[PDB]
Amino acid sequence: GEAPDHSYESLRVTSAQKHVLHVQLNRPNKRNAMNKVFWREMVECFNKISRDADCRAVVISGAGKMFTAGIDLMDMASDILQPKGDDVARISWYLRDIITRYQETFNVIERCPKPVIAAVHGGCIGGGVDLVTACDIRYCAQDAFFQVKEVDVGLAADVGTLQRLPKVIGNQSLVNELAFTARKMMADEALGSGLVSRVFPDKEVMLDAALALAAEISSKSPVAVQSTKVNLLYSRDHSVAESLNYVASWNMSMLQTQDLVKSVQATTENKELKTVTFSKL
Amino acid sequence: GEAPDHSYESLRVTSAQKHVLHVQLNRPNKRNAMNKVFWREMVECFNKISRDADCRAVVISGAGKMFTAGIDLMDMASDILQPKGDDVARISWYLRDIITRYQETFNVIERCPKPVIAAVHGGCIGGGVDLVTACDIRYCAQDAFFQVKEVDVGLAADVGTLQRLPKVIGNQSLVNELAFTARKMMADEALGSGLVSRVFPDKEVMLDAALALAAEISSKSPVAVQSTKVNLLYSRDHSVAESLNYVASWNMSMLQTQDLVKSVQATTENKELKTVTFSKL
Amino acid sequence: GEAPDHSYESLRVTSAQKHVLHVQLNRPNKRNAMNKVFWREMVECFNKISRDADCRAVVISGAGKMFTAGIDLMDMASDILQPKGDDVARISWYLRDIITRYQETFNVIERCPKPVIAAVHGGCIGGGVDLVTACDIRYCAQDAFFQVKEVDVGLAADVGTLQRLPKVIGNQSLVNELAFTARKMMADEALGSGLVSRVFPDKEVMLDAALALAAEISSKSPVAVQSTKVNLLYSRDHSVAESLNYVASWNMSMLQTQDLVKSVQATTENKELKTVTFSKL
Amino acid sequence: GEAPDHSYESLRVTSAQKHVLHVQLNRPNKRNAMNKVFWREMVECFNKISRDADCRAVVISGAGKMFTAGIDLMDMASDILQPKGDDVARISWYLRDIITRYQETFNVIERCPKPVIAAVHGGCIGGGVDLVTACDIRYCAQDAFFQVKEVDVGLAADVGTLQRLPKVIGNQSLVNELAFTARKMMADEALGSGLVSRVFPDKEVMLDAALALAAEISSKSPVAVQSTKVNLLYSRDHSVAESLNYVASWNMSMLQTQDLVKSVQATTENKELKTVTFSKL
Amino acid sequence: GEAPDHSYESLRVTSAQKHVLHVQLNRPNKRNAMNKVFWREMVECFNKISRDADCRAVVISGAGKMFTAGIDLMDMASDILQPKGDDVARISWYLRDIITRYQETFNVIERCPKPVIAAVHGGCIGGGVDLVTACDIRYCAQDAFFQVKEVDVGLAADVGTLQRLPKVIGNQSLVNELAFTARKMMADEALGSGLVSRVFPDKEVMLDAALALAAEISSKSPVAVQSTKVNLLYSRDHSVAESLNYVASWNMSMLQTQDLVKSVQATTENKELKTVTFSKL
Amino acid sequence: GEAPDHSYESLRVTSAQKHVLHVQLNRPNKRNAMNKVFWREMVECFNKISRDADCRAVVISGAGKMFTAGIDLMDMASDILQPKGDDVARISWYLRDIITRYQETFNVIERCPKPVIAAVHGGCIGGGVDLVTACDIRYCAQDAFFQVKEVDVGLAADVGTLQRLPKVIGNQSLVNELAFTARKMMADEALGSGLVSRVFPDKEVMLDAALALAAEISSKSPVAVQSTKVNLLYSRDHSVAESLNYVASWNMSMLQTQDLVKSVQATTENKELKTVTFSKL
């Protein structure tokens, strides 16, 4: 059961439960290696998701043994090792265009108003860290591990690892230790450092709980949920004083909604918020 | 024993020990619900505290079973559900004024140079999170729990939760999980995430230790303590390079104090810093 | 075995293993007290380290019983208690110059492209916190403890503690508790708060593992390692959107390196990255 | 004819024409010297103006020969030359409070959503520059001149001159020349540098044209006019990319207004915008 | 003679001289009114221009009597007056999407590395100001005038006028006067305020000189010209210290170009820079 | 008559009048070409000037026919055309170090608390623009002209032209026109654009008036003058709200000066400020 608007050869988007989309990497044979097709499809996929009014939560998982094997070196070797340009200056313009495009692949996850939940089972190596670091909520199984493979490949992480990983956990000493040595951080250590919110025995239990969390989010008011993410992202990049100003300007319109009337009515009564239906956003 | 300058019908400010003010929410019957009277009194109270030279530490606790029950829906329903304005644009201006005024209620806690210690016993629901997130140091009892009820009510947190909660803990995955689902985070989970500094068996033990901590702060130099908070708050909203510049400009005057002479003299000797008296600030 | 270019009376820089420099505080009799000589030598030392192409990692440890005893009050009393200037305005200019120079002592550690690893054994009091908070990776022994002694001395931390300590750990409640009360935070509590990455039984085991970590960093590509720190530091002071732009402009030149060809060649094969040699940076 | 809500002994607020308030400094004998009474009344006056729905434009002029004679040295000598505080640190806190309060006197002019028009006749010395630099539109007569007298008094401008004057004109070379030498800049030179928008033969012609400009502003949509100032002020303090984001969030509510329907209807027809009436804001 | 890749029904892009593109609004009958087709075509057109290696300069002019008549009210009335959404919150999301898309129309002009020259003849009303304010260099004829019609329509400028107009001229008093009153600013006044660089007797002379300026830009090194615009735009939105850091990171790659060798060789000799050919960028 | 502490082979610093230093480029034969010796001497010179208590104003002029001929291509060709490094990544690090050092040459002019006055006679080509754009006040003769030669050389201005020139004049259209075409802007056009403050018939009259302006600045309070520049520079890089906070923290110490007592005493009386002597700063 597809979207069915979402048809991709490297992703499988299946609508699960209600108002919940399950975006699943669909390259088990290559361990979900991020080839050239993957980068463009993610931008196309999460642009449709943002325009989708029915969708209220997004769950990102992986097929096969592991979540992802990182960047596909074979395809991306040609772009870096054989660039286009007569001299260095022309090559730098060519490379900066490629880097910017690949950064857009993970920006759309952050710019998507719907919450994104990452279900990581098995290894999450290299560029896969950027995939989960852009997600709002991160879950992992017992066998999962996170590795910043970029230094081993020979380049600094330029797709989002060095820009979001220090901003999603507080143990900055660990962040430097991981980035500089490219060592594997197991699930138990990940939970202690706050990279993930919960740890589950295996993929099946993790996936069920991740979808259950998405269903709970979809039950809430879509306006309140979407506005919460926008202000949470804005507050990260700005000071407290500016963020307080921005949320005042943002909420002066979002407060005039029928969701507020119904949610308060349900809250004052004993009815659960799952019963009350909200309009499409 | 009041201030006695602090006389309010929703707050009870009692001077405890020396140079320590115990601001206590005083609506046990309504579970310290934040009605219209509460918002204006907090601004009035913490403005006097800042002007108070004798006060050096502030402890915020609650009366009754729980710390607070969040925003009072009955009083605040009229402002949101029945706004003033001919059309949407006029309503937006009216709502933005209300939001800005309510944000000022918690800003004065942060702008107060004296350190603020939060003693949370029982539930801390909804807007009460903003009350403690603006405090410098957060304590809790074993039965305490923190809940961001705003999404359940039907609106994004626009009084300070989404602006300070991600900036007081590093586990950003938990922050998104709490905000989006509005679930209750118990005391044990709160300590692990760093929202609180200590957990105590009950309110009585927590309150005694909170006042003991405030007494220790009051023993230190008021200039050094007040300057520390100003630079700590400034460093949060600015880069390292700018903050280092600001503290150099800030300390070039605060270093010329008699406290430095006496504190060093006490430190060089065996006398405790509690013995040496400092001038009013 | 000195650098031998690094000859100082308060520091001992010994080249250990390969591409690893072991900068060691060398005043055991005074417990590594930071006198006037220490401040200027650190600036001189880490300026040479940055220009040193062979060096790829830096380890900061201490001699004697403890890592450091903080600022030397006897020498620094004259500067603060007996300043130069006819009136307050002239004194403020004189004091601001002193504060700015002492801040430069710890800035060069952060500005040094080579990673810096701190090995803390015994006490780390007062200004020593700024020494380790500027380091990328912090290790400690079982007996180590970190104390912000500045408030006890009678002044706010103006050399980097209040500016970097909140930005290296997420438990902001603890940061305020430490700064305001100047209490000692033992090694076990430090590990829980994320100030340190690992805790070792004693100095000997901690030092061996710290040098082992530095050797692992030196094995990686110097271009990738140095670029990683620059982007990690930049991402801390800037938003995600700006940092993504900066790394794109930074990596468009650093991608055109022979390290990328060799590291990928080793990664595609079974050869360890320690075998492949990289050019001096 | 007063407001009549605006009753002050140093200001005279007269309602002129319709939706236009004429705030007039009213100390001709002392040449509109800014005594202690003036500073507090301005904050009170422009807080009421912001809450005033009928007012749509504000014109600031002066009585007597000149617009203003700057700060009243006699009253303000006691605050600076005889401060309160045992030592320098206590005095610095006392002085910073005074400086911050006096800055609030001119901030409320900028924070007032209604446009403010400055009509300057005669001298505008010292702190009077901050009064006009906070205004949106500045007019002057032929005999008017602007002088930054702060350096002659012996202090740097700390009430807004050094913070807004470089941001209202582009000739930064002139700004440094004026600030450093405290020379008088006549009206003709002021027009060339862009400090004022127009120059008029005398006060009577300038005042009539200033009120005519305010009447034209009041004819426009109050929502559009008020929103324009908010975005213009925000765009000054922020980058283009952030400002474009903010105006999108601001206008998503202000676009849903009856003013847009009527203004477009008038624009499509031949009716002047002065005929169509708009609701109070 | 088209691009010929640029085929649009509202724009006419003709390749003039060498490495110069002449983008021309092509709706003379409707006075170049910006209908729905115009907004999407501009994004498509300037995306191709950026990817175009041969193009080195861009000239924007208009067909018919006037440069542009602003926004087409008839087409854009449906979007604003008849939005999509059950209540205000849904409408606000719908409107914010529309505003953001229309802002992207003018962002691509700024994000285009090639310099953009605006040739304005006849009126430039309303949204046309955003078109020229995003251009690097602005020219105008004797009969040209610039008007911010947004307030007359009934909304604040949300497409770029209020965000770039204060940042392209220094006379902030005039900017407020223009925005608040929506008056027409003739060419002579525009030159005095610095909105335009030159004024020409008519469109024919202005167009010839604008293309001559573009030819001179195309003669220079494309790497140096493109890099200059990137740093000029970055310096506008950032402080001096950050911009100096960014240009150092930007130029460390762009300095390694064959253009530097040839341009210096030509400069050392008497050969004009027009003779030396540079590689495509 | 030298400093005599300032002894350089590319600069001639002569003490003129009282508290005024006349820094003069001293390479007339090479038209004040900026060779490798020049860059390091400027950093050394303006570091001593900042530490110099007697100096209160600085005047920068040039010897020979013209102010300066820009960067010396012969010496700087080796650094750019023949860099050090095995591959591009090593070269980029080498080039970035060179660019950063050369930027420091002009930063010290801005960081010097004493005001700097530029006296430009004859041509001011290329890097000489950065020399004068870092100065507070710019004067020029009738024959002077300013040219941004960097694009003609083949590189973007990376020493300060693109970072400070847009921030010292408001005519941004002219800035893009100058940078992109590298044309010469004569003195009359420079005055109209606000790059210079005054235009004089020749060097002799310009130099006398520049020294007369410096003498007038030296007559004022050194604390007030130095503080004015610090806040003027800070206000440029920061918003109004932050700058108002910074000046409040800066002036809370600088207000407690004997200069304020004497300057007010002179101002209240008829004595000129030139008579009253102020202490060294």
Author numbering:
A (entry chain A), B (entry chain B), C (entry chain C), D (entry chain D), E (entry chain E), F (entry chain F): 48 to 328
Published text:
The first enzyme in this pathway, ECH1, shifts double bonds from positions 3 and 5 to positions 2 and 4, isomerizing 3,5-dienoyl CoA to 2,4-dienoyl CoA. A total of 8862 single particle cryo-EM projections were collected for this structure. From these projections, we constructed a high-resolution cryo-EM map of 2.96 Å and identified this protein as the ECH1 isomerase. The overall structure is a hexamer made up of a pair of trimers. Each monomer has two domains: an N-terminal catalytic domain and a C-terminal α-helical domain. The C-terminal domain is made up of a core of four α helices that interact with the other two subunits to form the trimerization domain. We did not observe a bound ligand in our cryo-EM structure but a previously solved rat crystal structure identified equivalent catalytic residues as I118, D177, E197, and D205.
Here we report the use of single particle cryo-EM to identify multiple proteins from three enriched heterogeneous fractions prepared from human liver mitochondrial lysate. Using this approach, we were able to simultaneously identify and solve cryo-EM structures of nine different human mitochondrial enzymes: short chain acyl-CoA dehydrogenase (SCAD), medium chain acyl-CoA dehydrogenase (MCAD), isovaleryl-CoA dehydrogenase (IVD), delta (3, 5)-delta dienoyl-CoA isomerase (ECH1), aspartate aminotransferase (GOT2), glutamate dehydrogenase (GLUD1), mitochondrial superoxide dismutase 2 (SOD2), catalase (CAT), and mitochondrial aldehyde dehydrogenase (ALDH2).
